[model samples]
Target: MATTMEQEICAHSMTFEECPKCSALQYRNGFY
Candidate 1:
């Protein structure tokens, strides 16, 4: 699915808002 492809790419190449690892911390800090 196109949505899957977009998510996969964002997980790696996107900003902290879209990154799994960084999003965890960012979410706590209200950055995402």
Candidate 2:
């Protein structure tokens, strides 16, 4: 099983943009 630290690290390694289903303050280039 993956450890908590590993999961946390993975989450931060990926790129995410804010959208209808995402939290506020998320913005995408050329979309706003």
Candidate 3:
């Protein structure tokens, strides 16, 4: 089974743009 540590690491590793649920900042200097 998956553990919380694995999930946390993966979640944190994801790029802001890669995050579908993320409505936060990803673009910068006119780039996605």
Candidate 4:
């Protein structure tokens, strides 16, 4: 399970590499 802080960190820590435009996390490896 994920805590609020953990979720916040994941949200804030996700890089553009894992969040490129015209892309999605489901398509990327090592994605959140």
TM-score of 3: 0.20
lDDT of each: 0.51, 0.33, 0.39, 0.41
- Give the per-residue lDDT of model 1 (tens digit) for 1-32: 74654343554456545565555555564344
**2 or 4, greater by lDDT:** 4
Whose lDDT is greatest here?
A: 1
The residue-by-residue lDDT of candidate 4 on 1-32, one tens digit each, is: 43443222334355434344224445554344
Off by over 4 Å in 2: 1-3, 6-25, 29-32
Ten residues in sequence with the least summed lDDT for candidate 3: 23-32
Consecutive 10-residue window with the lowest summed lDDT within model 4: 3-12
RMSD score of candidate 1 (Å) = 6.3
lDDT of 1 at 4: 52
Write candidate 2's Cα lDDT for 1-32 as tens digits: 54443222323343232232233325542233
Assess the local accuracy of residue 5 in candidate 4 as a C-alpha lDDT between 0 and 100.
39
CA shift at 15, candidate 1, in angstroms?
0.5
Best by TM-score: 1
Worst 10 residues of 1 by lDDT: 2-11
Ranking, TM-score, top scorer first: 1, 3, 4, 2
